[PDB]
Amino acid sequence: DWSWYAPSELVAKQIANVPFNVLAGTPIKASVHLRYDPSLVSGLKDQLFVGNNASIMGARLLYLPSFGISTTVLDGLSMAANQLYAYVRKSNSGAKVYEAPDLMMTVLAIQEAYRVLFEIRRAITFANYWNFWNKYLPKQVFEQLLAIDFDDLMSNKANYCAQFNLMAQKINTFALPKYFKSILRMAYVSSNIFMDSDAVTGQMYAFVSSGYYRYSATTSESGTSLVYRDWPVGAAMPRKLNRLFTVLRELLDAIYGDADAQTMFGDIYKAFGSDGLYSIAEISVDETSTPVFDVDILAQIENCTILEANAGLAWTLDSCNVTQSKGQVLLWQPTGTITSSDNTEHIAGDIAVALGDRVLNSHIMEPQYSDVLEWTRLMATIEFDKASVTSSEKVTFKVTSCGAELIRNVLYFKNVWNDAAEDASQRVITYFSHFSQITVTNATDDPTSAYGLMSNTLDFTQLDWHPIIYVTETSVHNVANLNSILIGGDLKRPTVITTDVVKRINSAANYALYYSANLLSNIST
Amino acid sequence: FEIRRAITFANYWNFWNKYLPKQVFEQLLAIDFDDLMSNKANYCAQFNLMAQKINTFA
Amino acid sequence: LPKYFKSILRMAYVSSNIFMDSDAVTGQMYAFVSSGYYRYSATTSESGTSLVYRDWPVGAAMPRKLNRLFTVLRELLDAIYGDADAQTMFGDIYKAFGSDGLYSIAEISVDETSTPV
């Protein structure tokens, strides 16, 4: 009750009305007075440290589009395929012109095409959101959170805006059935930007594909299949849309290049109809979208699992394509490698890490089965291959299971300011900090030591709802002489899921996404 | 006019004629589609300007 | 920027239109054109923050394209934003003026077209 500390209705409004004159992005000029003996400290100028970092902007969730780890005539995705196929061939009098997968393959190709077009839409839409209190927003966010050359977009928006609308109309003439629950997800994920609070000043997360999928009936003997080419993205050069369309064109002109695929498009309109197909909407003259405050999404974050569990190491990732052997089974299971920051070839004296039995945290006291399902699949399981290794080896791994997204690596950014501008465009640097999900007591944000595992630049706490950080402690540091692990993150109502219990859920969850059958006990058009 | 035609028809798409959008332009009208797509908005606005100029010619 | 500065209204009107010397379109017409611009800089003079004027390369040299005109505005604003102090000021202003106590320039419609006055 403030009424207490107020001697006068006035005197209060008089010395309490402090200003909140710090726009998110400007530096937090906080200061720390300190006293020491200059003789015993390796060079430290004054005894007053003025702040200089701005509140964190947000975090980039580099994810690898997922269809659900599948390697069986039964692992869901294939089931789904047969499912769909049946409904198309259902009341069709032609002859077997392509097996179940051949079809399914085509569809997904179309889906993934949209996943690009959508991120593009997002780019154009958000170029209109400006807020007097977040100087990050307009520009800086694009360049760091979405990895899109803003300066380039600004110069040629109108053209891109109109180009998008054209593509949209093209895409809307491609046989993708509007009933695939999976689409709705991917659409929502790459269409918005989520806030971590109902406040605009707060930080915000964003999802960004780490690449795309091309269609190709030449790449593997077994038949048509989808190849994944990496988005040159890992903090390299913040890409311009120019490049983003050129790739979509490649993508669709590729789906169109297979006579078989087209013959399929046909079979689909035959069985679904004018409006049985997905349609992405154009963009008006006014359109402008806004950052959203979706709690469910934050939860997904907090709980998720980062593949690159610790940026202090070097990660790989191959065999991300999706193939099909003996005309009836779909295949996809990405595999990677883990080496040290020095010998990109060996692992040496560093330590590979992945989490198994993990935590699950609910911000609601009475979590319902519903809330679980949703807050889950964003978390995945990674299993090592050999049981043991040598410094001269590589540490190989597969992905047991995961959600529809699969978070690869995560970075957050802040502005650091500089009074003495030796330049001008050099007096407001935007720097990143790697976010490691697994770490060790006494780690440092210097790749340098700590068995090759970095700690996190402590300012990450600014992200209310950040992923659970699991820190391991040597039996030494532990008060119980038995080694274990410490938990980090705003816990409220926690609980634990088994490696196996998690796999089992996604195995299901993903299947649900591409599930069709529910259009087999009743027919349309 | 042929220019107007070019800009206008860049919006017609039909699920049953994969020729239409592109291919037709390149062969039937002899107009670089890939080029138009990249810079439509600019051409659209340019056309409208010219139109106003032409409409001031006797 | 506070919407109450009478000075703004002037400069706005002066560089927004083109004036005729008669009610006739055939007549001749005058126009106002800045000979340059002003940058913000807290480094240029010891005494403190200050505004520097760089000549528009204009005196019947090469008739400039907008490409160049935006690039300079970007410089201009990214410059005002570069002073931590200045931002801390922006804040103090919203605190005392409010959402609509500030100046606002209006966008341009699909139809918009202005006329010589």
Is the separation of the CB atoms in A285 and A157 below 8 Å?
no
Is the separation of the CB atoms in A150 and A136 below 8 Å?
no
Token look-up 């035609």 returns B5
Helices (H), A172-316: 181-189, 241-256, 259-272, 295-303
How many CB atoms lie under 10 A from the CB of residue A404?
21
Interface of A with C in 383-442 (CB under 8 A): 417, 419-421, 424-425, 427-428
Distance CA A517, CA A83 (A): 6
- The radius of gyration of chain C's CA atoms, rounded to the nearest angstrom, is 18
Nearest CA among A146, A157, A172 for reference residue A124: A157
DSSP 8-state secondary structure symbol assigned to residue A426: T
- For Cα atoms A159, A160, A162, give the angle at the middle one, nearest 5 degrees: 65
Distance CA A126, CA A154 (A): 12
H/E stretch holding C75 reads helix C66-81
Q: Which fold has domain A25-55+414-430?
A: N-terminal domain of TfIIb (2.20.25)
Cβ distance of A256 and B42 shorter than 8 Å = no
Nearest CA among A408, A504, A468 for reference residue A65: A408
Residues near A43 by beta carbon (within 8 Å), at least 6 away in sequence: none
* Distance between A44 CA and the closest CA of chain B, angstroms: 56
How many CB atoms lie under 10 A from the CB of residue A38?
9
* Token pair belonging to C8: 């703004």
Strand partners, A60: A206, A411
Q: How was this structure determined?
A: X-ray
Distance CA A111, CA A187 (A): 10
H/E stretch holding C30 reads strand C29-30
Residues of chain A neighbouring C70 (CB-CB closer than 8 A): 155
**What crossing angle do the helices spanning A499-513 and A369-376 adopt, rounded to 10°?**
90
* Distance between B58 CA and the closest CA of chain A, angstroms: 33
Partner residue opposite B44 with nearest CB, options A162, A172, A245: A162
Distance CA A382, CA A354 (A): 6
DSSP 8-state secondary structure symbol assigned to residue A54: B
Q: Which fold has domain A94-192+233-290?
A: Butyryl-CoA Dehydrogenase, subunit A; domain 3 (1.20.140)
- Resolution of this model in Å is 3.4
Interface of B with A in 3-22 (CB under 8 A): 10-11, 13-15, 18, 21
* Rounded-to-5 percentages of helix, strand, coil across chain B: 70, 0, 30
Partner residue opposite C88 with nearest CB, options A22, A132, A155: A22
Distance CA C37, CA B15 (A): 54
Q: Is A495 buried (19+), middle (13-18) or exposed (0-12) by CB count in 10 A? A: exposed
Is the separation of the CB atoms in A318 and A334 below 8 Å?
yes
Distance CA A187, CA A204 (A): 18
Q: Within its chain, how far is the Cα of A219 from the centroid? A: 28
Cβ-based contacts under 8 A for chains A and B: 34
* Token pair belonging to A452: 């090759």
Strand partners, A50: A31
* Token pair belonging to A300: 């997904």
Is the separation of the CB atoms in A111 and A180 below 8 Å?
yes
Distance CA A407, CA A303 (A): 11
* Token pair belonging to B24: 């037709």
Is the separation of the CB atoms in A24 and A133 below 8 Å?
yes
CA-nearest residue of chain A to B42? A159
* Token pair belonging to A78: 């294939």
Candidates A17, A18, A20, A21: best to mutate against C (most CBs of C within 10 A) is: A21
Q: Within its chain, how far is the Cα of C16 from the centroid? A: 10
Distance CA A174, CA A117 (A): 13
**What crossing angle do the helices spanning A77-89 and A100-125 adopt, rounded to 10°?**
100
Long-range contacts of A498-505 (CB under 8 A, 24+ apart): A498/A357, A499/A356, A499/A357, A499/A381, A499/A383, A499/A400, A502/A358, A502/A376, A502/A379, A502/A380, A502/A381, A502/A401, A503/A381, A503/A400, A503/A401, A505/A373, A505/A376, A505/A377
Distance CA A383, CA A353 (A): 10
Distance CA B6, CA B23 (A): 13
How many CB atoms lie under 10 A from the CB of residue A432?
15
Distance CA A315, CA A408 (A): 10
Per the rule left: phi > 0, alpha: psi between -120 and 50, beta: everything else, A166 is alpha
The amino acid at residue C32 is: F
The DSSP bridge pattern shows strands A438-440 and A469-473 to be: parallel
How many CB atoms lie under 10 A from the CB of residue A370?
9
* DSSP string over A351-378: ------SEEEEESSSS--HHHHHHHHTT
Give the N- to C-terminal CA distance of chain C in Å, as an integer.
28
Cβ distance of A26 and C84 shorter than 8 Å = yes
Is A29 strand, coil or helix? Answer: coil
Is the separation of the CB atoms in B36 and B44 below 8 Å?
no
Q: Within its chain, how far is the Cα of A37 from the centroid? A: 48
Give the N- to C-terminal CA distance of chain B in Å, as an integer.
17
Chains contacting chain C through 3 or more C-beta pairs under 8 A: A
Q: Is A26 in CB contact (< 8 Å) with chain C? A: yes
Distance CA A375, CA A301 (A): 8
Distance CA A112, CA A93 (A): 30
CATH number assigned to the domain with residue range A1-24, chosen from the 4 options 3.10.50.40, 3.10.180.10, 6.10.250.3350, 3.40.190.10: 6.10.250.3350
Q: For chain A, what are the domain ranges?
A: 1-24, 25-55+414-430, 56-93+193-232+291-413+431-525, 94-192+233-290
CA-nearest residue of chain C to A286? C109
Helices (H), chain B: 2-8, 33-38, 40-54
How many CB atoms lie under 10 A from the CB of residue A423?
8
Distance CA B48, CA A500 (A): 64
Distance CA A409, CA A134 (A): 25
φ, ψ of residue A423 to 5 degrees: the values are: -130, -125
DSSP 8-state secondary structure symbol assigned to residue A161: H
Q: Within its chain, how far is the Cα of A351 from the centroid? A: 25
φ, ψ of residue A472 to 5 degrees: the values are: -95, 140
Rounded to the nearest 10°, the torsion over CA A358, A433, A203, A50 is: 130
How many CB atoms lie under 10 A from the CB of residue A139?
16
Token look-up 């050069």 returns A237
Distance CA A412, CA A74 (A): 39
Residues of chain A neighbouring B11 (CB-CB closer than 8 A): 166, 169
Nearest CA among C89, B37, C20 for reference residue A170: B37
Is the separation of the CB atoms in C105 and C13 below 8 Å?
no
Is A292 strand, coil or helix? Answer: strand
The amino acid at residue A515 is: Y
Token look-up 């899109």 returns A148
Q: Is A430 buried (19+), middle (13-18) or exposed (0-12) by CB count in 10 A? A: middle
Q: Which residues of A149-169 are buried (b: 16+ CB within 10 A; e: fewer)?
A: bbebbeebbebbbbbbbbbbb
Nearest CA among A144, A136, A114, A354 for reference residue A252: A114
How many CB atoms lie under 10 A from the CB of residue A214?
19
Distance CA A277, CA A500 (A): 37
Residues of chain A neighbouring C86 (CB-CB closer than 8 A): none
Q: Provide the CB-side half-sphere exposure for A64 (13 A, CA).
A: 30
Is the separation of the CB atoms in A81 and A88 below 8 Å?
no
Q: Provide the CB-side half-sphere exposure for A30 (13 A, CA).
A: 5
Distance CA A374, CA A304 (A): 11
Nearest CA among A495, A437, A459, A400 for reference residue A301: A437
Candidates B9, B12, B18: best to mutate against A (most CBs of A within 10 A) is: B18
Nearest CA among A109, A283, A254 for reference residue A191: A283
Distance CA A370, CA A332 (A): 28
Report the number of secondary-structure helices (H) and strands (E) in chain B.
3, 0
Long-range contacts of A75-82 (CB under 8 A, 24+ apart): A75/A507, A76/A507, A76/A508, A76/A510, A76/A511, A76/A514, A77/A104, A77/A330, A77/A332, A77/A510, A77/A511, A77/A514, A78/A328, A78/A329, A78/A330, A79/A511, A80/A104, A80/A511, A80/A514, A80/A515, A80/A516, A81/A330, A82/A328
H/E stretch holding A491 reads none
Distance CA A165, CA A188 (A): 19
The amino acid at residue A254 is: A
φ, ψ of residue A278 to 5 degrees: the values are: -70, 150
Distance CA A213, CA A261 (A): 16
Is A381 strand, coil or helix? Answer: strand
- Using CA atoms, how far residue A10 sits from A1, A3, A103, A457, in Å, is 17, 12, 74, 43
Interface of A with B in 51-80 (CB under 8 A): none
Token look-up 């340019």 returns B46
Q: Is A97 in CB contact (< 8 Å) with chain B? A: no
Partner residue opposite B40 with nearest CB, options A159, A170, A256: A159
- Using CA atoms, how far residue A204 sits from A193, A411, A414, in Å, is 7, 12, 12
Cβ distance of A166 and B38 shorter than 8 Å = no
* Token pair belonging to A214: 């091309």
Is C51 strand, coil or helix? Answer: strand
Is C81 strand, coil or helix? Answer: helix
Q: Within its chain, how far is the Cα of B18 from the centroid? A: 18
* Token pair belonging to A162: 């109109």
Strand partners, C40: C51
Partner residue opposite C95 with nearest CB, options A21, A27, A285: A21
Is the separation of the CB atoms in A136 and A226 below 8 Å?
no
Is the separation of the CB atoms in A452 and A312 below 8 Å?
yes
